[PDB]
Amino acid sequence: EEQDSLAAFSRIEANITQYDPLLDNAGKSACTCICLKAAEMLLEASPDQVNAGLIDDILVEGVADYNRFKVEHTSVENYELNTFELKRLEFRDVDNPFSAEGNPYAGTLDSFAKMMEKASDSKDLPKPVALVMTKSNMTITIVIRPDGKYWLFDPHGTNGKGAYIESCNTDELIKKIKEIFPKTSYPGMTEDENLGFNSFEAYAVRR
């Protein structure tokens, strides 16, 4: 009496199609709002609650919240986190000399694994905790679960569906990010070009 879920499958996809009018009308600018809705709903969930209908709910309610607030700057900071029942937690790259307290975690794609290790082994970040990560105006949500697994929620639109969630171990998560946010690299690329093509920012939130 239950739908297929993350308890038995490592990937679950929405029923809502990639080009459904609700998603097509809302732009890619709605991705950050949808990802904050994903944090809200997934941080409250257990693996067997995460089925295709829950992903559908994230998309629809995420778009509803986005339409209420639109009219663009669509950073996590532009949304009022209490309306998502979320709390922001301090989380940044203290090793980066340009970073300041209160900044998000910012770096190049090469720093992804380090970010995840700091997030998973930090006392200041309880579990479950979500990272909302933006690269080149596209956003994903990564849920760090107390069972050591990671849920990757990706609203980019894949295989004809509006979003999917994948449950990953540490190394598989690293490998999947390389596919979602491919790094730009060519012989002779400067660090200035690397920062311009390959930077991301991430915010940490909890319920």
CSV table of N, CA and C in Angstrom, one decimal, residues 48-138:
chain,number,residue,atom,x,y,z
A,48,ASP,N,11.3,6.1,3.2
A,48,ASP,CA,10.1,5.5,2.5
A,48,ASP,C,9.0,6.5,2.3
A,49,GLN,N,9.1,7.7,2.8
A,49,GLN,CA,8.1,8.8,2.4
A,49,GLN,C,8.5,9.4,1.1
A,50,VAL,N,9.8,9.2,0.6
A,50,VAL,CA,10.3,10.0,-0.5
A,50,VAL,C,9.9,9.1,-1.8
A,51,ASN,N,8.7,9.4,-2.4
A,51,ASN,CA,8.2,8.8,-3.6
A,51,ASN,C,8.0,9.8,-4.6
A,52,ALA,N,7.5,9.4,-5.8
A,52,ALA,CA,7.3,10.3,-6.9
A,52,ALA,C,6.4,11.4,-6.6
A,53,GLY,N,5.3,11.1,-5.8
A,53,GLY,CA,4.3,12.1,-5.4
A,53,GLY,C,4.9,13.2,-4.5
A,54,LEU,N,5.8,12.8,-3.6
A,54,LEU,CA,6.5,13.9,-2.8
A,54,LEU,C,7.3,14.8,-3.7
A,55,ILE,N,8.0,14.3,-4.7
A,55,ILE,CA,8.8,15.2,-5.6
A,55,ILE,C,7.8,16.1,-6.3
A,56,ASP,N,6.7,15.5,-6.8
A,56,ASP,CA,5.6,16.4,-7.4
A,56,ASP,C,5.2,17.5,-6.4
A,57,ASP,N,5.0,17.2,-5.1
A,57,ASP,CA,4.6,18.2,-4.2
A,57,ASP,C,5.6,19.3,-4.0
A,58,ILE,N,6.9,18.9,-4.0
A,58,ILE,CA,7.9,19.9,-3.9
A,58,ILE,C,7.9,20.9,-5.0
A,59,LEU,N,7.7,20.3,-6.3
A,59,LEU,CA,7.6,21.2,-7.4
A,59,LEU,C,6.5,22.1,-7.4
A,60,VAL,N,5.3,21.6,-7.0
A,60,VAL,CA,4.1,22.4,-7.1
A,60,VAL,C,4.1,23.5,-6.0
A,61,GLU,N,4.3,23.1,-4.8
A,61,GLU,CA,4.3,24.0,-3.7
A,61,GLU,C,5.5,25.0,-3.8
A,62,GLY,N,6.6,24.5,-4.3
A,62,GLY,CA,7.8,25.4,-4.6
A,62,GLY,C,7.4,26.5,-5.6
A,63,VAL,N,6.7,26.1,-6.7
A,63,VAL,CA,6.3,27.1,-7.6
A,63,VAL,C,5.3,28.0,-7.0
A,64,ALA,N,4.4,27.5,-6.2
A,64,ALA,CA,3.4,28.4,-5.6
A,64,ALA,C,4.0,29.5,-4.7
A,65,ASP,N,5.0,29.1,-3.9
A,65,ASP,CA,5.7,30.0,-3.1
A,65,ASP,C,6.5,31.0,-4.0
A,66,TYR,N,7.0,30.5,-5.1
A,66,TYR,CA,7.8,31.3,-6.0
A,66,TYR,C,6.9,32.4,-6.7
A,67,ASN,N,5.7,32.0,-7.1
A,67,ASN,CA,4.8,33.0,-7.7
A,67,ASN,C,4.3,34.0,-6.7
A,68,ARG,N,4.2,33.6,-5.4
A,68,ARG,CA,3.8,34.6,-4.4
A,68,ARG,C,4.9,35.7,-4.2
A,69,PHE,N,6.2,35.3,-4.5
A,69,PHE,CA,7.2,36.3,-4.1
A,69,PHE,C,7.9,36.9,-5.3
A,70,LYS,N,7.6,36.5,-6.6
A,70,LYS,CA,8.2,37.0,-7.7
A,70,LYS,C,7.7,38.5,-8.0
A,71,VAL,N,8.6,39.3,-8.5
A,71,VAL,CA,8.3,40.7,-8.8
A,71,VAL,C,7.8,41.4,-7.6
A,72,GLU,N,15.8,38.8,-12.4
A,72,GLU,CA,15.4,38.7,-11.0
A,72,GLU,C,16.5,38.1,-10.1
A,73,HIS,N,16.7,38.6,-8.9
A,73,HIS,CA,17.7,38.1,-7.9
A,73,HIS,C,17.0,36.9,-7.2
A,74,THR,N,17.5,35.7,-7.4
A,74,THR,CA,16.9,34.5,-6.9
A,74,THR,C,17.9,33.7,-6.0
A,75,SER,N,18.7,34.5,-5.2
A,75,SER,CA,19.6,33.8,-4.3
A,75,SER,C,18.8,33.3,-3.1
A,76,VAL,N,19.4,32.4,-2.3
A,76,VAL,CA,18.8,31.9,-1.1
A,76,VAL,C,18.4,33.1,-0.2
A,77,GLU,N,19.3,34.1,-0.2
A,77,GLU,CA,19.2,35.3,0.7
A,77,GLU,C,18.0,36.1,0.3
A,78,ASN,N,17.4,35.9,-0.9
A,78,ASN,CA,16.3,36.7,-1.4
A,78,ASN,C,15.0,36.2,-0.9
A,79,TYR,N,14.9,35.0,-0.3
A,79,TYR,CA,13.7,34.3,0.2
A,79,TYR,C,13.8,34.4,1.7
A,80,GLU,N,12.6,34.5,2.3
A,80,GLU,CA,12.4,34.6,3.8
A,80,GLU,C,12.3,33.1,4.3
A,81,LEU,N,13.4,32.7,4.9
A,81,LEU,CA,13.5,31.3,5.3
A,81,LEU,C,12.4,30.8,6.2
A,82,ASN,N,11.9,31.7,7.1
A,82,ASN,CA,10.9,31.2,8.0
A,82,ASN,C,9.6,30.8,7.3
A,83,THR,N,9.3,31.3,6.1
A,83,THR,CA,8.1,30.8,5.4
A,83,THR,C,8.3,29.4,4.9
A,84,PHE,N,9.5,28.9,4.9
A,84,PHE,CA,9.8,27.5,4.5
A,84,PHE,C,10.0,26.6,5.8
A,85,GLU,N,9.9,27.2,6.9
A,85,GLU,CA,10.1,26.5,8.2
A,85,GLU,C,11.6,26.1,8.3
A,86,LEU,N,12.5,27.0,7.7
A,86,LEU,CA,13.9,26.7,7.7
A,86,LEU,C,14.7,27.7,8.5
A,87,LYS,N,15.8,27.3,9.0
A,87,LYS,CA,16.8,28.1,9.8
A,87,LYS,C,18.1,28.1,9.1
A,88,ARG,N,18.8,29.2,8.9
A,88,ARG,CA,20.1,29.2,8.3
A,88,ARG,C,21.2,28.9,9.3
A,89,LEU,N,22.1,28.1,9.0
A,89,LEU,CA,23.3,27.8,9.8
A,89,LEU,C,24.6,28.3,9.2
A,90,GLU,N,25.4,28.8,10.0
A,90,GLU,CA,26.7,29.3,9.6
A,90,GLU,C,27.6,28.1,9.0
A,91,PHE,N,28.1,28.3,7.8
A,91,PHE,CA,28.8,27.3,7.1
A,91,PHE,C,29.6,27.9,6.0
A,92,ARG,N,30.9,27.9,6.1
A,92,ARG,CA,31.7,28.6,5.1
A,92,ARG,C,33.1,28.0,5.0
A,93,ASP,N,33.9,28.4,4.0
A,93,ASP,CA,35.2,27.8,3.8
A,93,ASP,C,36.2,28.8,4.6
A,94,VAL,N,36.5,28.4,5.8
A,94,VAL,CA,37.3,29.2,6.7
A,94,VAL,C,38.7,29.3,6.2
A,95,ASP,N,39.1,28.3,5.3
A,95,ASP,CA,40.5,28.3,4.7
A,95,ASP,C,40.7,29.3,3.6
A,96,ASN,N,39.6,29.8,3.0
A,96,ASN,CA,39.7,30.7,1.9
A,96,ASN,C,39.9,32.1,2.5
A,97,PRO,N,41.1,32.7,2.1
A,97,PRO,CA,41.4,34.0,2.7
A,97,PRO,C,40.5,35.1,2.3
A,98,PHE,N,39.6,35.0,1.3
A,98,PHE,CA,38.7,36.0,1.0
A,98,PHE,C,37.3,35.9,1.6
A,99,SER,N,37.2,34.8,2.4
A,99,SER,CA,35.9,34.5,3.1
A,99,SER,C,35.8,35.3,4.4
A,100,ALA,N,34.5,35.7,4.7
A,100,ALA,CA,34.2,36.4,5.9
A,100,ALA,C,33.1,35.7,6.6
A,101,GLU,N,33.0,35.8,8.0
A,101,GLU,CA,31.9,35.2,8.7
A,101,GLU,C,30.6,35.7,8.2
A,102,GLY,N,29.7,34.7,8.1
A,102,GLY,CA,28.4,35.0,7.5
A,102,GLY,C,28.3,34.8,6.0
A,103,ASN,N,29.4,34.7,5.3
A,103,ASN,CA,29.3,34.4,3.9
A,103,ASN,C,28.8,33.0,3.7
A,104,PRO,N,28.2,32.6,2.5
A,104,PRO,CA,28.0,31.2,2.2
A,104,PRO,C,29.3,30.5,2.0
A,105,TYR,N,29.1,29.2,1.8
A,105,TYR,CA,30.3,28.4,1.4
A,105,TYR,C,30.5,28.6,-0.1
A,106,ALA,N,31.6,29.2,-0.4
A,106,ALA,CA,31.9,29.6,-1.8
A,106,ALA,C,33.2,29.0,-2.2
A,107,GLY,N,33.2,28.4,-3.5
A,107,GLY,CA,34.5,27.9,-4.0
A,107,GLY,C,34.3,27.5,-5.4
A,108,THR,N,35.3,26.8,-6.0
A,108,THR,CA,35.2,26.3,-7.3
A,108,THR,C,34.8,24.8,-7.2
A,109,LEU,N,34.4,24.3,-8.3
A,109,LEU,CA,33.9,22.9,-8.3
A,109,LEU,C,34.9,21.9,-7.7
A,110,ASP,N,36.2,22.2,-7.9
A,110,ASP,CA,37.2,21.3,-7.3
A,110,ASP,C,37.0,21.2,-5.8
A,111,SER,N,36.4,22.1,-5.1
A,111,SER,CA,36.3,22.1,-3.7
A,111,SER,C,35.1,21.4,-3.2
A,112,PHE,N,34.3,20.7,-4.0
A,112,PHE,CA,33.1,20.1,-3.6
A,112,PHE,C,33.3,19.0,-2.5
A,113,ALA,N,34.2,18.1,-2.8
A,113,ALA,CA,34.4,17.0,-1.8
A,113,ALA,C,34.8,17.6,-0.5
A,114,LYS,N,35.7,18.6,-0.4
A,114,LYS,CA,36.1,19.2,0.8
A,114,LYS,C,34.9,19.8,1.5
A,115,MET,N,34.0,20.5,0.8
A,115,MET,CA,32.8,21.1,1.4
A,115,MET,C,32.0,20.0,2.1
A,116,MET,N,31.8,18.9,1.4
A,116,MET,CA,31.0,17.8,1.9
A,116,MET,C,31.6,17.2,3.1
A,117,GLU,N,32.9,17.0,3.2
A,117,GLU,CA,33.5,16.4,4.3
A,117,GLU,C,33.4,17.4,5.5
A,118,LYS,N,33.6,18.7,5.3
A,118,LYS,CA,33.4,19.6,6.4
A,118,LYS,C,32.0,19.6,6.9
A,119,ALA,N,31.0,19.6,6.0
A,119,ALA,CA,29.6,19.6,6.4
A,119,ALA,C,29.2,18.3,7.1
A,120,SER,N,29.7,17.2,6.7
A,120,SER,CA,29.4,15.9,7.3
A,120,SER,C,30.0,15.7,8.7
A,121,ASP,N,31.2,16.3,8.9
A,121,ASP,CA,31.9,16.1,10.1
A,121,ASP,C,31.9,17.3,11.1
A,122,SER,N,31.1,18.3,10.8
A,122,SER,CA,31.0,19.5,11.7
A,122,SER,C,30.0,19.2,12.8
A,123,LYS,N,30.5,19.7,14.0
A,123,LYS,CA,29.6,19.7,15.2
A,123,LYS,C,28.5,20.8,15.0
A,124,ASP,N,28.8,21.9,14.3
A,124,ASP,CA,27.9,23.0,14.2
A,124,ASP,C,26.8,22.7,13.2
A,125,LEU,N,26.9,21.6,12.5
A,125,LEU,CA,25.8,21.2,11.5
A,125,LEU,C,25.2,19.9,12.0
A,126,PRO,N,24.1,19.9,12.7
A,126,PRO,CA,23.5,18.6,13.1
A,126,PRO,C,23.0,17.9,11.8
A,127,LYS,N,22.5,16.7,12.0
A,127,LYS,CA,22.0,15.9,10.9
A,127,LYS,C,20.6,15.5,11.3
A,128,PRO,N,19.6,15.5,10.3
A,128,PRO,CA,19.8,16.0,8.9
A,128,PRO,C,19.9,17.5,8.8
A,129,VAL,N,20.7,17.9,7.8
A,129,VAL,CA,20.9,19.2,7.4
A,129,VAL,C,20.9,19.3,5.9
A,130,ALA,N,20.5,20.4,5.3
A,130,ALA,CA,20.5,20.5,3.8
A,130,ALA,C,21.5,21.6,3.4
A,131,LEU,N,22.1,21.3,2.3
A,131,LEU,CA,22.9,22.4,1.6
A,131,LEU,C,22.1,22.7,0.3
A,132,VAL,N,21.9,24.0,0.1
A,132,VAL,CA,21.2,24.5,-1.1
A,132,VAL,C,22.3,25.2,-1.9
A,133,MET,N,22.6,24.6,-3.1
A,133,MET,CA,23.9,24.9,-3.8
A,133,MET,C,23.5,25.4,-5.2
A,134,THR,N,24.1,26.6,-5.5
A,134,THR,CA,23.8,27.3,-6.8
A,134,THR,C,25.1,27.4,-7.6
A,135,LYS,N,25.0,27.0,-8.8
A,135,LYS,CA,26.1,27.2,-9.8
A,135,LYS,C,25.6,27.6,-11.1
A,136,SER,N,26.0,28.8,-11.6
A,136,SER,CA,25.6,29.3,-12.9
A,136,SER,C,24.1,29.3,-13.0
A,137,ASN,N,23.4,29.9,-12.0
A,137,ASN,CA,22.0,30.1,-12.0
A,137,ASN,C,21.2,28.8,-12.0
A,138,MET,N,21.8,27.7,-11.6
A,138,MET,CA,21.0,26.5,-11.4
A,138,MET,C,21.3,26.0,-10.0
